[PDB]
Design a protein around this nucleic acid. Structure first.
Lengths: 69, 74, 57, 55, 126, 97, 79
RNA sequence: AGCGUGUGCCUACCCUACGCCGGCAGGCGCGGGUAACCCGUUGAACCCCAUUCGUGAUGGGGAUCGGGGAUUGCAAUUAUUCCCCAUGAACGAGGAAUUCCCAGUAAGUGCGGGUCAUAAGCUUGCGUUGAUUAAGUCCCUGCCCUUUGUACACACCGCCCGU
RNA sequence: AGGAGUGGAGCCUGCGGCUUAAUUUGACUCAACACGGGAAACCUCACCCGGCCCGGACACGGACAGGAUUGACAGAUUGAUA
């Protein structure tokens, strides 16, 4: 119906030019962070995402202490 | 606070001095010993310079700076 | 016109500021007369500070 | 030579292109209303320019 | 095994066409860095890439190249070729993919070396 | 410093022709408010002026980003002794007296 | 060619301040007290107050013509 | 709602009013304003509300962090650049120590100037919602108008006694 | 016996503690510490892995149509069409 297509979660991802269907829990929360290719490329982004820390740079010494409590 | 400590490389340098010989031996020669002589440099066909602009010689791409001209066959 | 500046030339002491003011007052009077009369009334040995602008519009 | 170096990539926000018109100082510049004085020189000349303290 | 594709599309055929519709099946992150335009001092990195591409025998690692260009890429044809960039005080090299649109050369440096924790004393320890 | 002799004679006929001048200290910038379009490079003209007024025999006074000059007769005597131009050609500045 | 009234007033103030400093640093020895700029149709007449006037004008009005000329060539006024 | 700002001595840098159209700043054409004339009766904002909480981890206020075209600033990542899928974070008055504050205080909240390239988490101002407690004291920290003591006067961080 | 908002729950900076190119001038309680209106790529970085175009009104020295100036991609430089 050509309805405005910015309503799905992961859009314009690699491996497909469309937005396919998925279901069940224990699958979505992982795909909120598609971290296979960004680790394979030997990038700082994989370790920034992996340690539970910032990947864009939220300041973490006086403020910005939430994330593990 | 420390110093810049810029000493680990090139403690002393000598000024470069081009040994431009005062005699016309390397730059030009006549090889004729006569009133009329042959010129050892190809004629410049460009009209963007003067009538006495004479080009030097390198391995390629004769460097004058004003034109950066290179002989190419297109 | 307001210009607020630190009082100190250095950066020492209690952070104190000067609050400088400059107020520009504008009045416009409209009347119908040729240019000679306006030129004559301007030459009145005006007091300083009052900038006069006349436009034929 | 000279044109091979100068004016290549625009420095559109030059801090060093501005100076105080009284002492030619880089810092504390007052560019508002076109004063173009450093703040100390402005404080020295504020009364002559017409800015006076009221509040 | 077959080669991993790029956003469901190939490379060479799109590399033979113009840029009129090249972005319709790409990602962001060079979404418009490609569309920014061109200036001088852009071709040197690709020129050195091609020089190492031609003077290196097939299926062997090319010699180390020294430079620090923080630039952009438009064409993913150079799969199999990797960019050698200066970083810190040593050399760093990153495995390459046809996933060039959607990432940058300079997003591979860890300049956030962790704290070297000390044992402060003498003064205010409590 | 780093000043050629053709630019030297150029700035010298400028000093001969003007005598009483105002100026501002500008070196690097390529266009000038009031002493540009003189067919001579700005930097060499201003550096020659620096030589003129800072060689050590004519005094100056630097304030409010501008220059005002008293050209002593010792400098005129130096000019006459060097270039051999007599003062009989009086400057045209003696009009509207 | 034209600037807003705020910029114009500020520029007039800057001109007055710089003129005052200039003829303060020139002839402080001549008993100079202060300057007063008077507006006049298409004109800018300037009055200088000094305790000694024979020394600000000098012989044949030399000092006056010199410093008037330099003020002319400085402050962008027409010839 | 402001308070205010907005385009040549220098100078090359101003504030902004329709369409390409995915859903609007916006990559390009376009006019106005040296300004109570245009922005603008201040152009991606109240705090409100037929998306609502029946007794509090739900709809209620966001732990990162991914896409849609990015204002166009070489670089930004080794400081510039939007809201949406509801992916669930001690999810409801806080070691020792404490800083500011008495009515349009505090606090919440945005906006404008300065810096500047419309660069703010800073500061300087401005409105908007709106205020529990107190009209007292010298207890702590200090200050002042007295009397008193002093072996202090570098003035109690003083001076000074003891193998 | 008052309180409200606190530095701890949502937009990083100042300077010392604090590995080599990283903790870089002035400011040692109130009267230092988004303070020098100081929002550090760079013109303002001196902690900085690196350089070049360099200064003398004079005191004394080396001596004239040559005693060098930012000013070439491809054999490179230590990022750099230096």
């Amino acid at each position: 119906y050509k309805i405005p297509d910015w309503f799905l979660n992961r859009q314009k991802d690699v491996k497909d030019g469309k937005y396919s269907q998925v279901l069940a829990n224990g699958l979505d929360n992982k795909l909120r962070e598609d971290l296979e290719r960004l680790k394979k490329i030997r990038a700082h982004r994989g370790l920034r995402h992996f340690w539970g820390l910032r990947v864009r740079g939220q300041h973490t010494k006086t403020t910005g202490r939430r994330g593990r409590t | 606070k420390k110093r810049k400590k810029k000493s680990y490389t090139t403690p002393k340098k000598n000024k470069h001095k081009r040994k431009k010989v005062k005699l016309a031996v390397l730059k030009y020669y006549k090889v004729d010993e006569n009133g009329k002589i042959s010129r050892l440099r190809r004629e410049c066909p460009s009209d963007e310079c003067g009538a006495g602009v004479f080009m030097a010689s390198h391995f390629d791409r004769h460097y004058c700076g004003k034109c950066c001209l290179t002989y190419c066959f297109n | 016109l307001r210009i607020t500046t630190r009082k100190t030339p250095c950066g020492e002491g209690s952070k104190t500021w000067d609050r400088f003011q400059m107020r520009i007052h504008k009045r416009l009077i409209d009347l119908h007369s040729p240019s000679e009369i306006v030129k004559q009334i301007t030459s009145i040995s005006i007091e300083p500070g009052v900038e006069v602008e006349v436009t034929i519009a | 030579g000279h044109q091979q170096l100068y004016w290549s990539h625009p420095r559109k926000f030059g801090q060093g292109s501005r100076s105080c018109r009284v002492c030619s100082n880089r810092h504390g510049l007052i560019r508002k209303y076109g004063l173009n004085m450093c703040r100390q020189c402005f404080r020295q000349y504020a009364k002559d320019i017409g800015f006076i303290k009221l509040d | 095994f077959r080669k991993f594709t790029y956003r469901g599309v190939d490379l060479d055929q799109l590399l033979d066409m113009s840029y009129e519709q090249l972005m319709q099946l790409y990602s962001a992150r060079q979404r418009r860095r490609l569309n920014r335009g061109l200036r001088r001092k852009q071709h040197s990195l690709l020129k050195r890439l091609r020089k190492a591409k031609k003077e290196a025998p097939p299926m062997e690692k090319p010699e180390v190249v020294k430079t620090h260009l923080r630039d952009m890429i438009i064409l993913p044809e150079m799969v199999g070729s990797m960019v050698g960039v200066y970083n810190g005080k040593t050399f760093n090299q990153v495995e390459i993919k046809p996933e060039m649109i959607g990432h940058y050369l300079g997003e591979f440096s860890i300049t956030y070396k962790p704290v070297k924790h000390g044992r402060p004393g003498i003064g205010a320890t409590h | 410093m780093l000043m050629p002799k053709k630019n030297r004679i150029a700035i010298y006929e400028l000093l001969f022709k003007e005598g009483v001048m105002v100026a501002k200290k500008d070196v690097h910038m390529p266009k000038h408010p009031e002493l540009a379009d003189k067919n001579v490079p700005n930097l060499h003209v201003m550096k020659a002026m620096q030589s003129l007024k800072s060689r050590g025999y004519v005094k100056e006074q630097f304030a409010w980003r501008h220059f005002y000059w008293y050209l002593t007769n010792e400098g005129i005597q130096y000019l006459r002794d060097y270039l051999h131009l007599p003062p009989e050609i009086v400057p045209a500045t003696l009009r509207r007296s | 060619v034209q600037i807003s009234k705020k910029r114009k007033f500020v520029a007039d103030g800057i001109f007055k301040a710089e003129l005052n400093e200039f003829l303060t640093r020139e002839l402080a020895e001549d008993g100079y007290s202060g300057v007063e700029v008077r507006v006049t149709p298409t004109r800018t007449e300037i009055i200088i107050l000094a305790t000694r006037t024979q020394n600000v004008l000098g012989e044949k009005g030399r000092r006056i013509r010199e410093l008037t000329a330099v003020v002319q060539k400085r402050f962008g006024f027409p010839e």
